[PDB]
Symmetry: D2
Subunit: 459 residues, 4 copies
Amino acid sequence: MNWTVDIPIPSLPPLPTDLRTRLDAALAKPAAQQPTWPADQALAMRTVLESVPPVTVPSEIVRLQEQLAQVAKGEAFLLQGGDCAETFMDNTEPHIRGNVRALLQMAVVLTYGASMPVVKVARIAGQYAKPRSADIDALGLRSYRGDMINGFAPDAAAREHDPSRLVRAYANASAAMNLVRALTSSGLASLHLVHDWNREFVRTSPAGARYEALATEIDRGLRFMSACGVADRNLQTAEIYASHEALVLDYERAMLRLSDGDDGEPQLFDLSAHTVWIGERTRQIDGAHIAFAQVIANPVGVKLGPNMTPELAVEYVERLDPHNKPGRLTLVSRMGNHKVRDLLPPIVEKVQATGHQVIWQCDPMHGNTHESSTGFKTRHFDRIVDEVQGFFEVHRALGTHPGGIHVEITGENVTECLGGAQDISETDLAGRYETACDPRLNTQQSLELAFLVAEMLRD
Amino acid sequence: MNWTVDIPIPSLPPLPTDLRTRLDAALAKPAAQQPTWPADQALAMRTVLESVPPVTVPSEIVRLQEQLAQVAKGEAFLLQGGDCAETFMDNTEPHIRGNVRALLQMAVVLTYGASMPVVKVARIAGQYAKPRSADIDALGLRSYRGDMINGFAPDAAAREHDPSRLVRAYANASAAMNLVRALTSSGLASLHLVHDWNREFVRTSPAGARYEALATEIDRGLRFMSACGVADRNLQTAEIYASHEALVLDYERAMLRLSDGDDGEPQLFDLSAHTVWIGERTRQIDGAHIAFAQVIANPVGVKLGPNMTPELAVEYVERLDPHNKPGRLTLVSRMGNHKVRDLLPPIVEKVQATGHQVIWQCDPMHGNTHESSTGFKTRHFDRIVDEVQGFFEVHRALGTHPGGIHVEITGENVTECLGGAQDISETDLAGRYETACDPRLNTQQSLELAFLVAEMLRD
Amino acid sequence: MNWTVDIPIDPSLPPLPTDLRTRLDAALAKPAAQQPTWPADQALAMRTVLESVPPVTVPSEIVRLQEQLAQVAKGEAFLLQGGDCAETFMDNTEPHIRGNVRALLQMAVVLTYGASMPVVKVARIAGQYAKPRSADIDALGLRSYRGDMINGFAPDAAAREHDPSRLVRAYANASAAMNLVRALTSSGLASLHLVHDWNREFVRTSPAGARYEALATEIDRGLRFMSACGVADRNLQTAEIYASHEALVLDYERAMLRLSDGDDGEPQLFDLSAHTVWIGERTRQIDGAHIAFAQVIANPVGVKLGPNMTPELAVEYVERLDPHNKPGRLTLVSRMGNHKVRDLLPPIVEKVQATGHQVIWQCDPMHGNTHESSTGFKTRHFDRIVDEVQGFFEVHRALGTHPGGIHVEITGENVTECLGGAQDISETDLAGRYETACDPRLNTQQSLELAFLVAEMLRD
Amino acid sequence: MNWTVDIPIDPSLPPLPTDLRTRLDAALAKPAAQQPTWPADQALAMRTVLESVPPVTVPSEIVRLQEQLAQVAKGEAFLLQGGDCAETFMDNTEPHIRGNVRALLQMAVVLTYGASMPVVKVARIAGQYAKPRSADIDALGLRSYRGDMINGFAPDAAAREHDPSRLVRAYANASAAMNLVRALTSSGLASLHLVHDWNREFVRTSPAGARYEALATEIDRGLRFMSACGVADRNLQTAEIYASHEALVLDYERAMLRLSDGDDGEPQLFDLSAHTVWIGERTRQIDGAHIAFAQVIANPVGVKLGPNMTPELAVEYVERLDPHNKPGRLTLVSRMGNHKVRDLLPPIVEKVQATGHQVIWQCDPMHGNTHESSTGFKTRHFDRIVDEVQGFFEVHRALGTHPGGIHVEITGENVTECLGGAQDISETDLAGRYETACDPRLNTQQSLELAFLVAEMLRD
Ligand SMILES: N[C@@H](Cc1ccc(O)cc1)C(=O)O
Ligand SMILES: N[C@@H](Cc1ccc(O)cc1)C(=O)O
Ligand SMILES: N[C@@H](Cc1ccc(O)cc1)C(=O)O
Ligand SMILES: N[C@@H](Cc1ccc(O)cc1)C(=O)O
Ligand SMILES: N[C@@H](Cc1ccc(O)cc1)C(=O)O
Ligand SMILES: N[C@@H](Cc1ccc(O)cc1)C(=O)O
Ligand SMILES: [Cl-]
Ligand SMILES: [Cl-]
Ligand SMILES: [Cl-]
Ligand SMILES: [Cl-]
Ligand SMILES: [Cl-]
Ligand SMILES: [Cl-]
Ligand SMILES: [Mn+2]
Ligand SMILES: [Mn+2]
Ligand SMILES: [Mn+2]
Ligand SMILES: [Mn+2]
């Protein structure tokens, strides 16, 4: 009941000596949150992934870098979203399409609200690993760490760390990515279609009166654009980039490719994605993740939680954006809504005074979690909205650019987060919980967030 | 103190026999409102104008026809405006530019309000003749009939009908038209510049609070368009077409040219303009003006005042749109605001039942005139607005398309019409009256009308 | 000790509608030649996996291809179809895929110039992993290699057994390949001027470069002219390369069936394992399962027609596969041999034109011109390939019909598989780099050279 | 009894700023050759009329031309300038204007192909109504015709008197002409493919058609290639034809001065009677009013350089007229004669390049190659014109500089004015249709033929 892949038996060009040195130095540093599987099996899987067609190509990553530059300069806005954890079982056409649709829907609303371009980065085609605080979960089982490592099912065997999951992760990533590319160059990306869905959502949301005026104004803007002779064909094809947390270093090193351009010197690109981030757990300043990020040419992000200090933030900036390339680095604030107004300003002030131009991105989810009385991990919608609101106050008081958001969402009608216009309750949550990890905003709530964020952008 | 033009001494291709027959039959019919100057002098001036480069060319008139078709079908809107009477003395760069600017300004606002394209036709490059009810004016002088015929100065000599004014009219028309074409392909036509002026007008109008929300929504629509990657270069260059009242038949017949296309049969185009209209005075159903309009291939309009009947309107339609070509004919309603709600519906119903698709255009000026206690002919702004409002009610109750407006305006701060946000009074009017005929809405009032019309279009 | 890694498989979506399943079951109860002999229960489980994976292509790309092929069938565009004889899983790499994509784009710019009309680019890629065989025993005494979707090339009994997990492995490879084709076609790889310069290296370095110089300079001057008029790459619609393979393994194709949205038009059945597929010479029985599977799907399709073809049998393909008279829905692919095309093709084309249907007539030069070398290797002569294309063009010019395209087997590798061409590959040369897992392909130079020769035919 | 009609003239706008007027008065106190001799008070009244008319051109078109000519000066574009020797008011008709516009567009597509770079199209039109003279008495014993802006062509004393109302008549004609040029350049007249087909009629019907066939087919195939790649007319930026004339009559030019908006850049002085102007051979005194008027305006300008030119005098033109080093602000127009260009041009170009400035080097073949026929008429030989262009190109190739353009006198009429060419116009032929009111123009065929020959020079 399985498929069989050969271990090739030459293949990669050898790295120039300095890249090999710097890559080895980076991987020899300590690395948190890594799977515990045998080195020889890891090595065999890396040798397979070293021969595969990449998920992305370097030109796409260079274009993304240029678009991110604009965001860092206060002339575009970044929307990053999708599943908390993608699963092999739900890597289907409807699930992919629903996430693509939700992202495009949010994006048009935010574009209108910001009056500037929106860069769309999905959490997709690789978001298959997660860190854990505890090795042992509530049931006394070894913790689930996403499908790149082990299985979600609640038995011990399924929780064993499996290295064959690295190659399965790629098979799933490459399939999803192929479809995302097909979808972004189809009618799914027509602005006028994508907007139409907003019209359904205003009708069928119980808070629709609340969003009606903005949705009609967007509709009018779109018609106005058409009225001036702009048809879909002339516009740029929609671009949705791929991202995940660079967690599993066995996966990410096997997906490195050596590439030309940008002054003609060889560079390493992680071709498992367009951009990756380093989470709070793995961001050790001398650890392998950060040192790995220094070696790759892709845009990167770092998650900054409530014990971050202005000084450590600056050191992240100096280490990861050493050439001062606007857009190369994104700092992702995840403070909690009760803390973002106090904790973010001095980080922002200090980083701004270095002269570097980073993207300030708000992740209003990770700081605002709690277990419910009914058993399911969950987040209140109002706290999410309030963190983003706080984030915008911080930048407005400083005259800096609130550059983006990073959310966990899905294009399905899941019940995972409390609240919204549907008023999802603790009792409601049990009925439809579909996440393999953290609770995502459903279709309706992610849309509603886009509308509220658009108002924060307009004011 | 004059320039000297030779009478050529061959030049036009001979008309195909049927065009010559139909043209002669049309001109032999009686013609109201014609200048009384000697036939031999008229003939010499026609012979000069028969050799000149035309003001327009047929392809432009074919494109206009296609754009008017859209308006007749309920998918675009027509804005027609400029001077009541152009004068030789004010045919200057600033005056032309101010009228061009005012038209483009109004057009963007109306485009947003209608959510469909707006066709821009200026009263320009030929609007040099007007009909009169009385031969003798208030001062006992022979009436001024526009600079194509005679002079505005209040003495008898200057009021003599002069045929050399036909060639001077063309010299002025061709100059103005050259500049309109230069202007529409310059930065003057950038939408984002043109909109910016709206911002000045909201600030400096005393009713600016009233228009602020719509002006900000338009600004947002424009930014949104830019945010999606639409730059000025991609858009169609702005097109402003030329029109005047086809009054002086000596002028209009001399400006006829024979042309190919549209099924390859020879057609006559009046190359003095893109489209012309027939006013209330000259619209005799068996008169030379209407018969002339039947022979030319240009889009035409007919002014319909308060004694129009549904039956005569149908006969205009059958005579002028005999092939059923949407857009070929525009019926211009000029009823007065107190009468438009009663008089227009049955005309519209009857014409709609013929199957022809005309453009319904409102001229809310000509029905709403009065002499003031202070001496100057004048119009109240509120009555103008109310006629347009009535016009829209009529079409909305019938489900027909309110297709356009036809206004007299200027890009200067004249005091000619009573009212508006500036609250121009009878006492105010004397200080700045600059028209050679009827009172035009000034810059501010024509803008304000565009905003109010945009709201009528949105509701 | 086996140098393999096993990959486990596991929950599905709605089934296809019952009424459509009823039709499909009826068509697929027809006999099917050349099918793998794995067990039914395992094939079923693998099909169940593939019924819910993300598709390789999507319906609106196929509807778009249909519109472009309608243009080819009406005589206003030209079809270029080309790539590996058989893709292998071990060679399904970035460089190999980049090279085939490059080679197709290079051929296309040249044929576009020659033809003065748009060229539709269809690769044999992302699924060309199954082939028929004549003998169930090969020269080494083993059961025959059927393509990676069925068994392995290695000359070992274990590897030659029919393994249905190879259906999923095929999918994984097709989807990765297609992902990369999409990426590359929207990159600078597709820029017209860049791709042409390659053409210029080719003239510089080919030993017959002197004779293609003129057409190459002319192409270059055409490109520089485009650009001098203000045309930048941003002004041109992005490069579209479509995927195709021979629809052979019906467990794979049926599991990749999908129903469209229905928003554009009533929902229709598409094979989303590719954009277009063709039925080969050995599986085109008129009453067989291949031709019937082809009738049921909405994709454009092809049928290979070899020297035994009769004009009446060709007419039956047209009535079965283009019942609604949709231009470009059916391609007839002539593969007759260069010594026979001039005789055998004309009456097929007369009979088919007389039906009123608008098929695309495509030439496959390579298949009918295969032979063995004295040095062992299977091979084809470049001149014979060329001459079949020439003869195909003469038949069409004589008849007043559209020579609509070519279908060729090529790689962007500098392999030594076909004899002849400007490099004058010899029988001794074949052992240098004979890399095909099936028939001899034109190498990178030969495939370009062929494109320059077909451009001259298009101009004539 | 006079067959004329008189047209009366009449209230003005702000004057030009005082500080700018002060500068202009100083420059125009310099002596001015070849000026009309009408009275000052009447000239003044006519200038006052022209100071408030709508301009012929507007500043942003001139700033755009400047950017395109900067590209010519850097070696990435080519200048085509062409039209009537002298426009007449009586021939300023739709057909005559359409014909010159067509001829320029036809030449341009061919030279664009040849050069593989954009061609900037500048017509001599909408103001070419004044010419210098050598003698104040002509062959009929009358004072000389100076162009319609000064006096009339008819051989009568009354008509030859200098009439300043002709300044306004010139304006009226220029503006009408320009209006029509603008209309035509945004019509189907400007569509690349349509204009080329004309080229194809020309090959069919020229008696030397056989020798331009190859380049014409190649151009055609380039166009069909553009279109096969998806380029439609809507994808191309609209045709821009710029207006130029010789700035000769300083009452006209000064009255047409305008100050720009200043929004783009600090407001500058532009002659809005045209987009660009040049100073002729007889009015280019370094300390004269023409060169000084040219220093004060922002338009791009040209200076004609004939056989008496010295490299030092050329350097002074560069320092006076391109003081800020703005590429393409100055064009140097060589008109040396075909027997002299190879000798005389090289040291001028060496000296000017050594200044660091980037001028456009333009060839005027026609002017230096003028002679009288045995049959009376003034005339030029096609071969000599051709050979001067050839010699100009050799000088530049030898020096490594950019042969930047040509400047020619042409019409779209089938006139018989220049000798030679494929029609082999003879001395007897000249009386058939000698229609120029001044020098012999290339007719429609000859001007196209020249374009095909210069394209070959650009390719070489
Ligand atoms: N995959 C190699 C890195 C590498 C990447 C690209 C190369 O071309 C070569 C080596 C590693 O993990 O060590
Ligand atoms: N093409 C190689 C590697 C591969 C593995 C898994 C894939 O999903 C894709 C490619 C194989 O099939 O063995
Ligand atoms: N001007 C002519 C009409 C006409 C127009 C065009 C022609 O080509 C000829 C005649 C008239 O008034 O009678
Ligand atoms: N070109 C003719 C006719 C003409 C008359 C007046 C113009 O405004 C333009 C042209 C002339 O100058 O006599
Ligand atoms: N998501 C399923 C099916 C799948 C199989 C292979 C792929 O290559 C892609 C998807 C799995 O992981 O088993
Ligand atoms: N409007 C002025 C000036 C003018 C003169 C000639 C023209 O050709 C144009 C405008 C006039 O009528 O006298
Ligand atoms: Cl290495
Ligand atoms: Cl790349
Ligand atoms: Cl006639
Ligand atoms: Cl036309
Ligand atoms: Cl689709
Ligand atoms: Cl301007
Ligand atoms: Mn999460
Ligand atoms: Mn009026
Ligand atoms: Mn084969
Ligand atoms: Mn001359």
